[PDB]
Amino acid sequence: PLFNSILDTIGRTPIVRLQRMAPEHTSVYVKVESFNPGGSVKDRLALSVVLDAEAKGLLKPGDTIVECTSGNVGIALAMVAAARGYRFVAVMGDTYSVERRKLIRAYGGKLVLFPGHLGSKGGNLIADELAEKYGWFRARQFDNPANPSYHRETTASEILADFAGKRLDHFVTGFGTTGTLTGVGQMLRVARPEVRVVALEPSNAAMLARGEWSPHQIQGLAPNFVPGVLDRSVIDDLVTMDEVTARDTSRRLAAEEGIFAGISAGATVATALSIAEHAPEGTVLLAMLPDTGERYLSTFLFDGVDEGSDDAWLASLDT
Amino acid sequence: PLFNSILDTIGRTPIVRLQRMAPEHTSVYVKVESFNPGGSVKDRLALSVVLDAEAKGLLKPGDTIVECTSGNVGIALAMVAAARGYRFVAVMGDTYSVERRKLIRAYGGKLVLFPGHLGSKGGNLIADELAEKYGWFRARQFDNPANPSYHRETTASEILADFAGKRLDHFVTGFGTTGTLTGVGQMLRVARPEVRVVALEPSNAAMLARGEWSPHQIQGLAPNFVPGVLDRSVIDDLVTMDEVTARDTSRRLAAEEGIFAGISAGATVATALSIAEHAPEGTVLLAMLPDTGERYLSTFLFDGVDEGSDDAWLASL
Amino acid sequence: PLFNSILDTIGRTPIVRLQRMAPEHTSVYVKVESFNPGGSVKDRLALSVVLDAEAKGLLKPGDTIVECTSGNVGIALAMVAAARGYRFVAVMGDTYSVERRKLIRAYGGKLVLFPGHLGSKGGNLIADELAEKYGWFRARQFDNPANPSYHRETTASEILADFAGKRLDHFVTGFGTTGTLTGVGQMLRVARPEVRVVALEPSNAAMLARGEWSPHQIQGLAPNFVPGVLDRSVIDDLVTMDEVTARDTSRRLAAEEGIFAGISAGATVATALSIAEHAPEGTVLLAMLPDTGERYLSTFLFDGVDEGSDDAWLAS
Amino acid sequence: PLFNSILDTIGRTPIVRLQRMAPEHTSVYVKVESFNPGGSVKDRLALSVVLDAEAKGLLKPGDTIVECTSGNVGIALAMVAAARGYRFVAVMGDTYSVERRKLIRAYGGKLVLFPGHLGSKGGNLIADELAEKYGWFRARQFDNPANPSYHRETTASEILADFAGKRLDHFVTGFGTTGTLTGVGQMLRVARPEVRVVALEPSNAAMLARGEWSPHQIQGLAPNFVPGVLDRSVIDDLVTMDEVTARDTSRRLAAEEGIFAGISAGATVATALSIAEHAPEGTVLLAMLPDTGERYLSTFLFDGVDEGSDDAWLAS
Ligand SMILES: *Cc1c(COP(=O)(O)O)cnc(C)c1O
Ligand SMILES: *Cc1c(COP(=O)(O)O)cnc(C)c1O
Ligand SMILES: *Cc1c(COP(=O)(O)O)cnc(C)c1O
Ligand SMILES: *Cc1c(COP(=O)(O)O)cnc(C)c1O
């Protein structure tokens, strides 16, 4: 139980049961990836990507890593780079919450921002450019097979072990790099063919099911393209989810269950409740909670939330 | 295995070894309490007080809990209340950060603001008042024995079990409600008398060493009084730490080890290091890391932290 | 944390590294299934079979479970029966140790014996008669998909999780029901196709290699037929092991590493060492340790072990 | 995660709830020490005694450990030495179970038999002589502070952690070296002063009550002398248990709960049930289960076994 490195605490996250949000004749369990030291499921690929690189001789002590940090991946790489002795450089838009900025500089990352109006790929480009220019290492979160690999061996094993001999009918997840859905899905389809793998997409960005994509707010989900690490054959059910319904459900999870997660976590739970609403008696669902809601205080997850005293509420108590 | 409630994940936090921040002739271990669902050590006292009130029959379903808080205690109580189905009311000054407000509200907590300058003792009167006026339950983080009690049964147990049959010389911690220092200290006193219980406090608030308190920046540490839940006899070495040193140490922990923790965590690691410097060869130290640094962005933890790219360093060669 | 039933402790067994028995340029790990409450890997299929039957509505507390056994399955089933409120009847050949009899009885199980030479084929036939005659539930460990299924979900997950991000090159295991080999093997294929599935059989019972069988002494291994649960496609290297090398390797493990396991475990460890001897630097192997050697005392495992004092040694 | 050595799996044993043996108005939990690699709670003192000697410099590579044992201490010390690479020498009566010897032999331990009668302090001095004569290490289980220490740091910690924020009214345990009673009791007294520590003694061996000893059949308990490691200030209730009632409770535990433990385990559970019968509603008890019942196959725990075939029973 004594741990050598903080990176040894990655994975083995808890799966907990929702106490009141689910229909009584149903059971909805949830996987909290905020328990990872990085506060998100990205701790998995970041650690896997780097360990795979080292064993491949692509990374050496003191080396430098660079990637296009949309948010969590940057924080996880920064943490892993810091913990293993690497330098980390991430490229994020000029217009990106100053918090997602301070977080990276916290782990000692050297940040370089470009005009946000460059549609993301601008950094994704200056990533490989600055990479070969100095022989820097690129994670390639979207194409590095170590990503779905770590999920096959850890995430899936954790889910499989927890539900062994027990009932499980639905596994719900959204996708960004698609590593989670791919890895867990491949393991599930073989081990539990009966479990329906449910993949959700933001209502406006139904890339997979309609080739359409529009800037959404369900952070960490549906990027402007389809990752090559994806194995869509694993998907049993492809659905959509409104960013507002997802934001609202994330808020409910917090106030009604005490589980403070982000938007994509609200989306998965929303989809689960949806299926549960009309599901047969005794249906068991599992939803993925990708990260902590703590890094969302400055996003639409907190839009319309009172900041002052609850005078009105106090007043309603004496009348 | 599956967990029934999110509250069943509280505690059993990891103790990790610092990989490079400590003198090669020493081993410095760190207990990362940010792994608690609530992000801080307070998850323990929050759970303990509620489970305790329920057993004594002081908390029935749908009841509401009130507490004058400003930091992690309010977040923890709110989370626990949200998970147990209780209503929670946080009484805090308006001078306190807004982010702190959003956290308590995220968990469905009710906010009751009051003039900051009024100070703790002021808001405590407010909480006491509401509590009586409406018959709500008061946590009393500074006097509730269930607070240190839970550290004796969990925190201490985790430390003892991880170090069983292994060397351990110093256990370093600061104190707010002192629940951690008192509880773990009482168990170590019986199990490992050789371990020095090092209790640190802010220099400009060496409230115990020299009975002097004054606004410091090590959030969570040394209140302006002496908690009734404390047992001073447990302390072996009473020292002081500087907020700037604590702050820097914290920035190092994050950048050099990959462990992003609060300022009070920087303080303990700092004292642990100071002891490590001029210490026997092979000595082993354990320092408490109270919370996650993620809720310290609007703090002097990021005084002059670059908020924009540094294309200056971008060309060196 | 607290456990509700003893059955909730099944699985999640430890994998330990051999300290001195393996070639220095190599790493041999071992999965100790004796940590299961029932003392062997059989606790996995016994729990899984019963839980599946319950879900299917085929088993109801108070019902009677019957199964042909070589020893371990009987103990496991008997233990689970005692834990869930079921009656258990074991069909075993007299050939097996009376200490395997007391163990099944200790859990309150009932014992029905038949001529040892009939083998698993004969007992299965007997278990079946009794099943029809009394409406008893048949576990059918060689055909019940719940057997390999539980290994995919647990054993495999434990192995995959333990080695995530680490080097693993070989996985060695013998087979009886073939649940472990099939379950772990099929999941190894999906997650780590490179790893080589090494499947051993007793030299005198190469039912797969040469379709031959003959009463052997590596308990738990090679029945007189090919289990229907089996999926041969999972095996990369099919090898043989002599019972004496097995027996002696199990002794070495106990005396040189502090790990006291059975004979089949001696076999898998021997096979792993052999491979490791001529394997490239850094090769990592994992051997399955089916059970505790504590139930092999009155067995050839303790053939001629000095039951008397070695005053001679004291002479010096 | 992967374990470096087999010794790294010592401790952290599960606490499980009895399903049908306890009065419904009550809850009886049980700590199963048989989950230790060595099969008993002695794994804790054995490891602790060695790491302490090593740190103190009293043990160096190749050094040899000797101790007079016929029970679990020998087995535990035997395994530890085998994993640590020390030599182990056991001193026991030649009239003892040929299996108890086999166990020590399995772990590569040397055997020096001696007159059964002179058992007690005799075989001990024979080890005492060998100790100074050859410069060998003596554990001193009954007086070594490291025994209770390890219990205060692991056993007690596992109990306190599992019951944190939950009800716990009674802790029941017997004593041999008294290391468990002392260790768990000292930590219990500090964190949970209201939990009543119940120490039982065999009916004919009430050493603490009136200093009277007599040979009994509850293996592991009541030596013929009050151990120096004992702390009487932690005992709330001193009770006695009849060895037959213990033996029978052990049988019940296995057959009714699926938990196979030794005689002393039957004894503690017997005491817990007794306390539970007339205890207020909601009372929670925890009882220590010292070892596996698997090494009691040649003891009275198995008298009237009926090792044949349940042909008679089959008739109906
Ligand atoms: C990475 C991420 C996801 C999607 O997970 P993948 O494994 O990349 O499919 C969902 N939500 C958030 C907040 C993320 O960071
Ligand atoms: C509560 C707290 C402490 C002090 O812990 P106590 O157990 O109350 O003494 C230290 N740091 C932070 C950030 C805290 O929230
Ligand atoms: C059951 C058993 C095996 C073989 O395992 P399967 O999963 O049934 O193939 C090997 N050794 C022993 C001692 C066994 O009991
Ligand atoms: C050692 C032992 C005990 C008594 O435990 P102590 O901690 O030595 O007091 C009880 N039962 C058995 C079977 C034992 O081996």
mmCIF file of N, CA and C in Angstrom, chain B residues 19-53:
data_model
loop_
_atom_site.group_PDB
_atom_site.id
_atom_site.type_symbol
_atom_site.label_atom_id
_atom_site.label_comp_id
_atom_site.label_asym_id
_atom_site.label_seq_id
_atom_site.Cartn_x
_atom_site.Cartn_y
_atom_site.Cartn_z
ATOM 1 N N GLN B 19 9.898 11.732 -5.220
ATOM 2 C CA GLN B 19 10.956 11.178 -6.062
ATOM 3 C C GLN B 19 12.234 11.994 -6.238
ATOM 4 N N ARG B 20 12.207 13.277 -5.892
ATOM 5 C CA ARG B 20 13.403 14.089 -6.062
ATOM 6 C C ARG B 20 13.500 15.326 -5.168
ATOM 7 N N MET B 21 12.406 15.689 -4.512
ATOM 8 C CA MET B 21 12.402 16.866 -3.654
ATOM 9 C C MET B 21 13.038 16.668 -2.277
ATOM 10 N N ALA B 22 13.582 15.491 -1.998
ATOM 11 C CA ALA B 22 14.166 15.274 -0.679
ATOM 12 C C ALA B 22 15.627 14.848 -0.671
ATOM 13 N N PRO B 23 16.366 15.227 0.387
ATOM 14 C CA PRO B 23 17.785 14.880 0.531
ATOM 15 C C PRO B 23 17.994 13.382 0.324
ATOM 16 N N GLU B 24 18.892 13.032 -0.595
ATOM 17 C CA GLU B 24 19.185 11.640 -0.930
ATOM 18 C C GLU B 24 19.428 10.707 0.254
ATOM 19 N N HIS B 25 19.753 11.266 1.415
ATOM 20 C CA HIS B 25 19.998 10.445 2.600
ATOM 21 C C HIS B 25 18.727 10.347 3.443
ATOM 22 N N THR B 26 17.610 10.752 2.853
ATOM 23 C CA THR B 26 16.341 10.741 3.557
ATOM 24 C C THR B 26 15.191 10.290 2.660
ATOM 25 N N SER B 27 14.095 9.874 3.287
ATOM 26 C CA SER B 27 12.908 9.444 2.556
ATOM 27 C C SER B 27 11.743 10.264 3.069
ATOM 28 N N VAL B 28 11.116 11.016 2.173
ATOM 29 C CA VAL B 28 9.980 11.852 2.548
ATOM 30 C C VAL B 28 8.722 11.350 1.851
ATOM 31 N N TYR B 29 7.745 10.957 2.663
ATOM 32 C CA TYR B 29 6.478 10.429 2.181
ATOM 33 C C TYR B 29 5.370 11.450 2.341
ATOM 34 N N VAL B 30 4.383 11.365 1.467
ATOM 35 C CA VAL B 30 3.298 12.323 1.505
ATOM 36 C C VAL B 30 1.906 11.670 1.439
ATOM 37 N N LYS B 31 1.007 12.072 2.345
ATOM 38 C CA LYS B 31 -0.375 11.551 2.374
ATOM 39 C C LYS B 31 -1.304 12.544 1.658
ATOM 40 N N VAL B 32 -1.703 12.164 0.451
ATOM 41 C CA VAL B 32 -2.546 12.955 -0.445
ATOM 42 C C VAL B 32 -4.042 12.848 -0.156
ATOM 43 N N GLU B 33 -4.534 13.689 0.752
ATOM 44 C CA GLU B 33 -5.941 13.671 1.129
ATOM 45 C C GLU B 33 -6.870 14.314 0.102
ATOM 46 N N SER B 34 -6.319 14.715 -1.037
ATOM 47 C CA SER B 34 -7.124 15.305 -2.092
ATOM 48 C C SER B 34 -7.828 14.181 -2.851
ATOM 49 N N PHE B 35 -7.505 12.933 -2.519
ATOM 50 C CA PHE B 35 -8.139 11.795 -3.185
ATOM 51 C C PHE B 35 -9.550 11.541 -2.644
ATOM 52 N N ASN B 36 -9.918 12.239 -1.574
ATOM 53 C CA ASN B 36 -11.254 12.113 -0.996
ATOM 54 C C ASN B 36 -12.185 12.742 -2.032
ATOM 55 N N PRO B 37 -13.422 12.244 -2.153
ATOM 56 C CA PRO B 37 -14.365 12.809 -3.132
ATOM 57 C C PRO B 37 -14.543 14.327 -3.013
ATOM 58 N N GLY B 38 -14.530 14.822 -1.783
ATOM 59 C CA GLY B 38 -14.689 16.240 -1.548
ATOM 60 C C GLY B 38 -13.432 17.041 -1.809
ATOM 61 N N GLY B 39 -12.370 16.357 -2.212
ATOM 62 C CA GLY B 39 -11.124 17.040 -2.513
ATOM 63 C C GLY B 39 -10.263 17.494 -1.353
ATOM 64 N N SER B 40 -10.634 17.140 -0.130
ATOM 65 C CA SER B 40 -9.853 17.558 1.022
ATOM 66 C C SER B 40 -10.019 16.634 2.208
ATOM 67 N N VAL B 41 -9.194 16.862 3.219
ATOM 68 C CA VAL B 41 -9.214 16.077 4.445
ATOM 69 C C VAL B 41 -10.545 16.188 5.194
ATOM 70 N N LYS B 42 -11.244 17.306 4.991
ATOM 71 C CA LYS B 42 -12.520 17.578 5.665
ATOM 72 C C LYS B 42 -13.638 16.596 5.384
ATOM 73 N N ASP B 43 -13.483 15.790 4.339
ATOM 74 C CA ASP B 43 -14.480 14.783 4.023
ATOM 75 C C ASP B 43 -14.638 13.878 5.245
ATOM 76 N N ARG B 44 -13.526 13.607 5.922
ATOM 77 C CA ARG B 44 -13.541 12.735 7.090
ATOM 78 C C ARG B 44 -14.356 13.303 8.252
ATOM 79 N N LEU B 45 -14.056 14.535 8.654
ATOM 80 C CA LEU B 45 -14.791 15.123 9.753
ATOM 81 C C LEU B 45 -16.254 15.333 9.377
ATOM 82 N N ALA B 46 -16.519 15.637 8.109
ATOM 83 C CA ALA B 46 -17.896 15.848 7.656
ATOM 84 C C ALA B 46 -18.709 14.553 7.797
ATOM 85 N N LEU B 47 -18.127 13.445 7.345
ATOM 86 C CA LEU B 47 -18.782 12.148 7.414
ATOM 87 C C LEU B 47 -18.975 11.759 8.866
ATOM 88 N N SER B 48 -17.887 11.818 9.625
ATOM 89 C CA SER B 48 -17.932 11.464 11.038
ATOM 90 C C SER B 48 -19.027 12.191 11.832
ATOM 91 N N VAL B 49 -19.060 13.517 11.734
ATOM 92 C CA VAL B 49 -20.069 14.298 12.451
ATOM 93 C C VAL B 49 -21.506 13.877 12.084
ATOM 94 N N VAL B 50 -21.754 13.637 10.799
ATOM 95 C CA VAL B 50 -23.086 13.252 10.356
ATOM 96 C C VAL B 50 -23.470 11.840 10.772
ATOM 97 N N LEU B 51 -22.551 10.891 10.631
ATOM 98 C CA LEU B 51 -22.844 9.523 11.022
ATOM 99 C C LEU B 51 -23.026 9.484 12.528
ATOM 100 N N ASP B 52 -22.280 10.333 13.224
ATOM 101 C CA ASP B 52 -22.365 10.406 14.674
ATOM 102 C C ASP B 52 -23.694 11.008 15.127
ATOM 103 N N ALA B 53 -24.117 12.085 14.476
ATOM 104 C CA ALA B 53 -25.369 12.736 14.841
ATOM 105 C C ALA B 53 -26.542 11.800 14.612
#
